[PDB]
Design a protein around this ligand. Structure first.
Ligand SMILES: *[C@@H]1O[C@H](CO)[C@@H](O[C@@H]2O[C@H](CO)[C@@H](O[C@@H]3O[C@H](CO)[C@@H](O)[C@H](O[C@H]4O[C@H](CO)[C@@H](O)[C@H](O)[C@@H]4O[C@H]4O[C@H](CO)[C@@H](O)[C@H](O)[C@@H]4O)[C@@H]3O)[C@H](O)[C@H]2NC(C)=O)[C@H](O)[C@H]1NC(C)=O
Ligand SMILES: *[C@@H]1O[C@H](CO)[C@@H](O[C@@H]2O[C@H](CO)[C@@H](O)[C@H](O)[C@H]2NC(C)=O)[C@H](O)[C@H]1NC(C)=O
Ligand SMILES: *[C@@H]1O[C@H](CO)[C@@H](O)[C@H](O)[C@H]1NC(C)=O
Ligand SMILES: *[C@@H]1O[C@H](CO)[C@@H](O)[C@H](O)[C@H]1NC(C)=O
Ligand SMILES: *[C@@H]1O[C@H](CO)[C@@H](O)[C@H](O)[C@H]1NC(C)=O
Ligand SMILES: *[C@@H]1O[C@H](CO)[C@@H](O)[C@H](O)[C@H]1NC(C)=O
Ligand SMILES: *[C@@H]1O[C@H](CO)[C@@H](O)[C@H](O)[C@H]1NC(C)=O
Ligand SMILES: *[C@@H]1O[C@H](CO)[C@@H](O)[C@H](O)[C@H]1NC(C)=O
Lengths: 108, 115, 437, 123, 116, 425, 112, 430
């Protein structure tokens, strides 16, 4: 199983990018948001649906409502261009569910 | 017992594996021993029941965490702190918390259940 | 954030409780819960606990328990009140070997019989250490402080191993660090329900039948620079010691009252030869060399280590005192501690005297009489440690000399209960977490 | 306690056995949960398994029949064995340290990812 | 402890927790004060078992399906909550207590158990 | 309206249990016996059926018995004594009160005997028919009080076990019985000194408002009256008989401390009280007695009637020596309708049959040097027989401890309670 | 007390309280008496621990989610409730109950 | 079908627990009545030979006997040289030499004085070394009984703690081993009397409608047979030896009670049974003994084999003195498929009961003539166990360990342990 995720998308600098994660087997489980840039290992940026990891700027934020989770990036700079993923833990099925990944690209 | 194996594990790692399935003179000795064991077991069980967590090994309560008890973080005390360290840093604050747990959410909730 | 309550959190504090018996089965080993099929030991990974061998409460509780067991066993036994009589004694110069001259005495005296109006003139052989003149008129050394209780011949003094188990809600922390001095942090800990077998061996200068160190000789002390604090040396290879009483003595039975019998000493069948202990010389010096090497670490590799005998005091502190198959030996350990190491077959024979009136545990007013053991006695044991003392400071010198010391008998059990400590568990814990209701 | 670069054979023949070893650095490996995540060449992340040294282990049921995971605390390492390798298994395997909180809701988070070992399935 | 003895029956129903904690903590003297500890433990366990039979389980302030028989003091709730302490309530209910215990024991618990 | 169950209800009834002592066979005390004052309470006390007293009696008896277990049993002292008078500065008074007795005694050696001598008080020797013997040899030989243990009464605090409570009344004018408007719940009793005395209660507590008279049924003459003092009356007791204590070894490890030679003159031990203070306190007592017997009765204080020396005399312990003082000068007065000192001549005894038990005595060793003690008379024990005569009383020792455990009682707590409420399950 | 020893299990299931109530109550004599009392208390507590492990600490009759495996008994619900006593059940179910307690622990700790 | 847990279930298992006293007023008073509940339709296996009650009762009775002797005088000075002559008073020929007149020296209250005293000692207490000594001086110093403490057997009841029950077999024909159709549960036992006797059970409990015969193995000659009588056979035991006890002050507060002068003549102490009653009782015994031993056997009753006096004689305690009677006139008969029997009795004062060595008690003399009437309600027999060649088997009075006395009382009682956890299938679910 793979969680649904927003289609790969592009923003103009200074705008806000929203990445959505959803699925039937998602429910209220907290979502962790991960970043992936070329030349690096993936890093936690968001935990427990709203907790900013160390080094995560105040621009990044999280929310969870229903079976939908939203990673909101405000005042986007070209440094944010990367592949972004959502992850949850299903205790009933005892499985990690990762997102399909959304490629956030920057115009201009 | 012998569950102490997670003593060095961080609290977040402890908590979890902590849901896995769980003549006339020495006669005074191994009678005070067992009486004390029974008294302590009953005291912990009664204290839990007073807090409203009678059967639950992990029990969330309605007593907000005061901003003068830890004030450290929530991602490091579960990933960079052990339970022994936590008890060392929290000790002599546990009595106030026990009082808050006992007064609130059970004495202030059982009465409101039928009011 | 909200308070969450966890039951089963792994937290302990230092605490003192009443650990109980554990044997592996005529002493008090029957009123002691027997051991489990196989000990349940768990390894606390990555935990560093602070131990202190010198402030342990297990040592004191073992002390009190052993005194209580000894006193309990010397209760239903005969109380030698009538023995406090005027003894007419002569010497025993028959097959004397130029060295046990004067040490034995042949004393005749009147004692009570089973009938209250009749007396019997009996005789017994008493050691010189147990008689005193009252100005050829003698009296037992105890008949001016207390009357002695005769040890029942049925009981055995052979130390049976005993394990100490913590009660429910408590744990024992074993320190498995090979190089653990005995104070401070031990970065390899396990939790055990019961200790390993600890033999309640009673000895003064040489620790016997104990637990060996691993890979090196260990020097332990409360304060190394304090000359008033004893130094505990734990060996890694045992030094075998053979103790014998060559005399083939015969045991009499004197009826001193209704149902009360006093076991005197009859005529010795054979010659009178001193009791002695033998220690192999080569092994002793190869072990004392290791002790010197380890001692140089706490004093510098230029100082010279000298070994001299006991300074002074009573016979239970200036001699290696032990109990070899029911008989109480007091041996002169002057040929062992006599050496000087600066910077770089054969046997040693320690003479031993034998005592029958024993004031064990430095208690005054409570004595015990050991009945004779018939026949030749021979016992082989392991020297597994020493208890030394450093004299004064001798400031501004390159010479440090060490003398054997007795001290208390607790020091005999500090050497076994050094890797253990007792802790109290708190299942309960409160932590901040995101919850409600 | 971050991971050192993983150890891997580089190439494994089909139907072969893949062995990967991750060595924890800057701390003990008995402090947290540790896990393995394979990144596909396309870019998808598939969680493989993870565990804490005391014995609790979570293995992806889709690979339960051929995943073996273990730790060695003396050498401060973990090992993954993947039996009967197939072409689809070719991926970059990351060794990740994790967190875990557990209240009423169970939780895991992949904290510090390793550089990863590339595994190509070829004869 | 016991600070609400002279207070109203309801105001005292805000402190049931402080009177519950105090309910549990030579060879001759030790034996004398061991049976005190064993007695306290067994008395607390008997009270808890009595509550558990009555379906109170671990609660302090329960609610029972037994209806209040009118032949018990004939008073109104205002009087039995606002101008009277627990002590005169205890002295007024006396005798009429084993009947209450039986009604709680069987009329509610056993009846509901066989009902389910 | 439906039944509702409450656990932790603050109710109690009178109880019987075993309390434990908290000293400063006993355990350490608390930093403070926190008294929670119970407002709007009115509870009925009865000082005369209190089992806190019947428990303290057995507690002190057992503590005394266990303090004599290891001590020397003077069995060999039961021998034939050859005695003579003690001359040489004997004084006109205290003539024949001391005897110089020689006797054969056992040594540490079972076959040797020593001729020793000692001074015995006349009250401890009886003639056999010059030749005498100790008074206890007919009944039982008895232990010797070890010099290491002292007889000084250490305070003991009685504490309620789990599930019980101790209620202390704070009323200033308690009669000992009846309602008490001001009650508190105290965890452990205050320091109560187990002072053993007769007639005059010593080192007790004071009434804080006025002289208090406590009786069970004050119209029953058989019952005794306990009188409590608002102000203490100082009593100075002395034994001006500087004497040596010699050690005789009577066996292996057993020593008997005898009396040697008294250095100086022989003078009678006595207790001094102030005449003015005693008259004032007796006036207060008479005034309070008039409240209960009417304001026109003649109050006459006469001395004790008869019986043993342990009931006809004020008996106490002054620095290890057991005094029996003749208090017929204190209770000798008559009140109709409205410096100087009183000297009470005392006698010292060495064989003590405490607590009226028969078959177990105790030998109090002599105390070297002059003995002096000062103490507070803070109560009396009286017995009554148009004029009412009151005499000093010497009843059972419980009355001594009643006057201290008179504001305390033990109650048993009931957690369970059932009340009607508007709720249903 | 024990009066329903011969009655059927259905007819003995309404007299559970009487049995449950009697489960709670020189110097050498006191040792034995106090030891017996403490032992009784320990049995009551250690068996209430079992009850609370299966999630019904406050109840006298617990109904769980464990399926009744046919491998034990394999008989009708009428014979074993209207034609037998509990003592007859003890002998038949003995040397199986040590696994039933398992599958009674799990099906509560893990399922819920 | 799902597992359903029941607490309070009525099932039990055999146990070996500890029971406590119920001494009616170290033992507590009973309730107004030990109510019993009859269990209908219950069959329980009883075996009185593995009963733990008969062992605990032994230890309890020994311990209570020891406790009553703690505060009493220890006759250590009594172990002296006695100069004894024969009584030679107005004796009969069967009392020649049985009593001795001994003069001896005892400690006074004053330690330096000694008193010359005399006492009358039975022959069984003195051993010659005209110089004798008490028979115990070789082994221990006897503890004299306090003259106030009595040797009456007072009823005691054994009550099981919480979580245990006592099952009583009401079956009349119960032979001691096997199923018992009629079972009741009692809070605790009826009044059981610790009567100490050998060869003859005294003032015990009778059977109903038949004389009962019990044995661990009727074919094993090494197991004593217990016979329980339908009707009592009354014994009259007397000591026609009007006595005088004098107190001797042997220390500071210690008195020793010694036999003074027997005023009048001296005769044998003796017991009497009725000839007719004994013959009828033995007829019932033989009739019920044939049922186990073939209808064509010949039954012989003979006297005891030999050994100690405590086993070869009917030993009991009559009014505070300890009798040992010669039971040869009762067990002397052969049985083929208003008179009185007089049993002569000797009297001892130094007694060591329960086969214990080193602890002995000295029973003080009891003033005046002592008479007692009691019921024989059973026998402890033992078969000779010879050869099958003969069709005649002989039975001799036994008198082994004292547990046989208390078995004959606690044979209908067993102790059980309540297991209240029960699992049964029920629909319900969840
Ligand atoms: C250090 O440890 C070593 C080994 O663990 C100890 O050496 C052991 O010492 C004991 C005690 O001396 C010894 O046990 C005796 O061995 C004898 C020879 O093998 C036995 O004959 C003797 O049995 C008698 O004593 C028992 C205890 O009382 C009785 O139960 C037994 O029935 C025997 O008693 C009868 O027989 C004797 C025979 O002479 C007779 O005199 C008696 O009256 C009675 O009739 C013990 O078993 C071990 O054998 C020694 N072990 C070894 C390997 O040699 C050493 O003592 C320890 N050192 C210290 C300081 O504790
Ligand atoms: C104490 O003395 C008595 C009297 O001699 C001993 O009893 C005798 O023991 C011998 C030894 O076998 C027997 O032959 C005699 O028949 C016994 N006589 C009696 C009257 O019993 C007794 O054994 C001695 N006790 C001891 C030595 O412990
Ligand atoms: C929590 O307690 C601390 C005292 O340690 C206090 O300073 C703070 O104000 C409290 N906060 C709340 C919200 O009660
Ligand atoms: C006995 O020995 C003592 C001490 O050794 C000695 O003084 C004395 O002379 C000796 N007597 C004889 C007769 O040998
Ligand atoms: C002095 O001693 C004699 C004889 O012992 C005696 O009669 C006399 O009473 C004694 N004196 C006094 C005052 O008692
Ligand atoms: C002992 O004798 C005295 C008189 O000498 C007497 O008063 C006392 O009562 C006697 N005790 C007894 C007989 O127990
Ligand atoms: C004591 O005073 C009370 C009043 O509080 C009264 O009831 C009682 O009778 C008095 N008793 C005596 C002996 O005076
Ligand atoms: C008796 O006299 C006293 C004097 O103090 C007085 O207080 C009291 O009222 C009087 N009683 C009467 C007159 O009845």
């Amino acid at each position: 199983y793979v969680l649904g995720q927003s289609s790969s998308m592009s923003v103009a600098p200074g705008q806000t990018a929203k990445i959505s994660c959803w699925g039937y087997y998602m429910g209220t489980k907290p979502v962790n948001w991960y970043q992936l840039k070329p030349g690096r290992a993936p890093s936690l940026i968001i935990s427990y649906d709203d907790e900013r990891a160390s080094g995560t700027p105040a621009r990044f934020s999280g929310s969870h409502s229903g079976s939908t989770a939203t990673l909101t990036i405000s005042n986007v700079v070209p440094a944010d261009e990367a592949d972004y993923f959502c992850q949850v833990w299903d205790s009933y099925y005892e499985e990690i569910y990762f997102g399909g990944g959304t490629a956030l690209t920057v115009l201009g | 017992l012998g569950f102490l194996g997670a003593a060095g594990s961080t609290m977040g790692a402890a908590s979890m594996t902590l849901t896995v399935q769980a003549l006339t003179v020495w006669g005074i000795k191994q009678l005070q021993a067992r009486v004390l064991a029974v008294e302590r077991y009953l005291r912990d069980q009664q204290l839990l029941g007073i807090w409203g967590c009678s059967g639950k090994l992990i029990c969330c309560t309605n007593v907000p965490w005061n901003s003068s008890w830890s004030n450290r973080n929530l991602s490091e005390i579960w990933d960079n702190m052990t339970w022994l360290q936590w008890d060392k840093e929290i000790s002599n604050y546990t009595q106030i918390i026990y009082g808050l747990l006992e007064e609130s959410q059970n004495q202030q909730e059982k009465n409101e259940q039928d009011l | 954030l909200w308070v969450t309550v966890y039951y089963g959190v792994p937290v302990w504090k230092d605490a003192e409780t009443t650990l109980f018996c554990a044997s592996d089965a005529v002493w008090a080993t029957h009123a002691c819960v027997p051991t489990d099929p196989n000990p349940q030991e768990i390894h606390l990974e990555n935990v560093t606990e602070e131990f202190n061998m010198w402030k342990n409460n297990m040592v004191e509780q073992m002390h009190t328990d052993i005194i209580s067991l000894w006193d309990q066993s010397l209760k239903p036994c005969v109380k030698l009140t009538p023995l406090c009589v005027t003894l007419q004694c002569t010497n025993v110069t028959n097959n004397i070997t130029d060295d046990m001259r004067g040490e034995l005495k042949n004393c005749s005296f009147n004692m009570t019989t089973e009938l209250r109006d009749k007396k019997q003139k009996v005789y017994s052989l008493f050691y010189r250490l147990d008689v005193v003149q009252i100005n050829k008129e003698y009296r037992l050394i105890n008949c001016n402080t207390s009357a002695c209780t005769q040890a029942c011949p049925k009981v055995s003094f052979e130390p049976i191993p005993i394990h100490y188990c913590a009660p429910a809600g408590f744990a024992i922390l074993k320190c498995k660090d090979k190089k653990f001095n005995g104070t401070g942090p031990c970065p390899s800990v396990s939790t055990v329900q019961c200790t390993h077998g600890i033999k309640p061996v009673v000895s003064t200068q040489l620790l016997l039948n104990g637990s060996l160190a691993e890979e090196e000789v260990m020097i332990r002390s409360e304060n190394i620079t304090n000359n008033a604090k004893n130094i505990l040396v734990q060996f890694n290879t045992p030094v075998q010691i053979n103790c014998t009483r060559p005399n083939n003595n015969t045991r009499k039975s004197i009826r001193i009252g209704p149902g009360q019998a006093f076991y005197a000493t009859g005529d010795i069948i054979g010659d009178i030869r001193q009791a002695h202990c033998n220690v192999s010389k080569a092994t002793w010096n190869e072990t004392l060399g290791k002790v010197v090497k380890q001692l140089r670490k706490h004093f510098g590799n230029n100082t010279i280590i000298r070994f001299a005998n006991s300074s002074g005091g009573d016979l239970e502190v200036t001699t290696h005192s032990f109990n070899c198959g029911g008989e109480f030996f007091y041996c002169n350990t002057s040929g062992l501690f006599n050496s000087t190491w600066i910077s770089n077959n054969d046997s040693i024979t320690l003479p031993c005297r034998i005592k029958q009136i024993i004031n064990m545990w430095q208690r005054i007013g409570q004595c015990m009489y050991a009945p004779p053991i018939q026949g030749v006695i021979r016992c082989v044991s392991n020297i597994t440690g020493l208890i030394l003392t450093r004299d004064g400071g001798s400031t501004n010198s390159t010479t440090e000399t060490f003398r054997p010391g007795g001290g208390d008998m607790r020091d005999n059990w500090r050497s076994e209960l050094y890797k253990y400590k007792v802790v109290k568990i708190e299942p309960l814990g409160v932590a901040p977490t995101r919850c409600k209701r | 306690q971050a991971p050192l670069p993983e150890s891997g054979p580089g190439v494994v023949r089909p139907t072969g056995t893949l062995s990967l070893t991750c060595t924890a650095a800057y701390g003990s490996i008995s402090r947290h949960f540790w896990g393995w995540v394979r990144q596909s060449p396309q870019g998808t992340l598939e969680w493989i398994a993870h565990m804490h040294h005391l014995g609790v282990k979570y293995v992806n049921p889709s690979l339960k029949n051929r995943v073996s995971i273990s730790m060695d605390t003396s050498k401060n390492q973990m090992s993954l064995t993947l039996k009967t390798v197939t072409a689809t298994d070719a991926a970059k395997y990351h060794c990740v340290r994790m967190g875990a909180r557990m209240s009423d809701i169970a939780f895991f988070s992949f904290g510090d990812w390793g550089p990863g070992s590339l595994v190509t399935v070829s004869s």
